Structure 1
Amino acid sequence: VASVSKRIMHNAYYYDKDAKRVGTDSVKRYNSVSVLPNTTTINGKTYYQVVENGKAVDKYINAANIDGTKRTLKHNAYVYASSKKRANKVVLKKGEVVTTYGASYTFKNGQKYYKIGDNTDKTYVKVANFR
């Protein structure tokens, strides 16, 4: 079957066609998985169907961990590499659209951050700056 390599942008569990998790393992960022090119919808959410050993299997990865999610900033936001370290001097402005990858991360400061940027760089934005 036709397969395409997709980079995992956020630690992703495997799910079956019933939105229930498959196994205890998880594919870690930023590794690559082979999936079907066209996407599918489970419970309204977008998924990729995993291809293993040349055949499609009952394993699905949430597309938010591959394609991400286009979000709009409601505040001006800095780009962070950790809780206290700034990643650069980029200042994202209110109204700009940014793609975030996967569920938010809780840093050690207690606040929650979104991984941004289609790359492997430690670039995070506070969730409180979105919606």
Structure 2
Amino acid sequence: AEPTVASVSKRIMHNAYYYDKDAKRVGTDSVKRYNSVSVLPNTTTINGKTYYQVVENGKAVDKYINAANIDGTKRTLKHNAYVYASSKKRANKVVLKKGEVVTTYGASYTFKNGQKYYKIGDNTDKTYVKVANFRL
């Protein structure tokens, strides 16, 4: 009966638009990683994509966040991979191995070197893996 008793505060892991039920961007705001937003805990599906419905001022509103930006996407490495903070800087000494399941959070990032990277890790750390390592 009260959306604000049911709501959970999810951490945004990739900057996120608000969408309406027609999967069109609504308004001019976006939630920035790694801020949190109040949503209903059960996802819904709009045009074959998974979303969380926003709760604002006591009510479930016609504003939806793509679950890719909160839960991310489970992916498998097709190649061994390093973890990068930026184009040239390694984040750590980890070697992720071919076949490992890794969750990536939202759309890839093109770095200054022109290569694409996904954010990994259930945390605010600057830890990115090359998109190429998820493809054959």
| 2:121 is the counterpart of 1:128 | no
What residue ranges of structure 2 are gaps of 5+ in the alignment? Answer: none
Give the superposition deviation at 1:70. Answer: 0.2
Report deviation, 1:86: 0.2
Q: CA deviation at 1:65?
A: 0.2
Residues matched between the structures, number: 131
Q: Determine the structure 2 residue equivalent to 1:77.
A: 81
Shift of 1:53: 0.9
1:51 matched residue in structure 2:
55
Deviations 1:88-117 (A, max 9, x none): 000000000000000000101100000000
Match 2:90 to one of 86, 90, 112 = 86
Q: What's the CA shift for 1:12?
A: 0.2
Structure 1 residue runs of 4+, over 2 Å off? none
Distance 1:52 1:107 in 2: 35
| CA drift at 1:23 | 1.1
Q: Unpaired segments of 5 or more residues in structure 1?
A: none
C-alpha separation between the residues in 1 aligned to 2:98 and 2:34? Answer: 29
When normalised by structure 2's length, the TM-score is 0.95
Give the C-alpha shift of residue 24 in structure 1.
Answer: 1.6
Residues 56-97 of structure 1 show CA distances to partners (whole Å, capped at 9, x for unaligned) of: 000000000000000001000000000000000000000000
Q: Deviations over 1:27-70 (max 9, x none)?
A: 00000000001110001100000000110000000000000000
> In the aligned structure 2, how far is the partner of 1:79 from the partner of 1:65?
20
Q: CA deviation at 1:25?
A: 1.4
Percent of paired sites with the same residue: 100
Partner of 1:129, secondary structure, is helix
- Normalising by structure 1, report the TM-score: 0.98
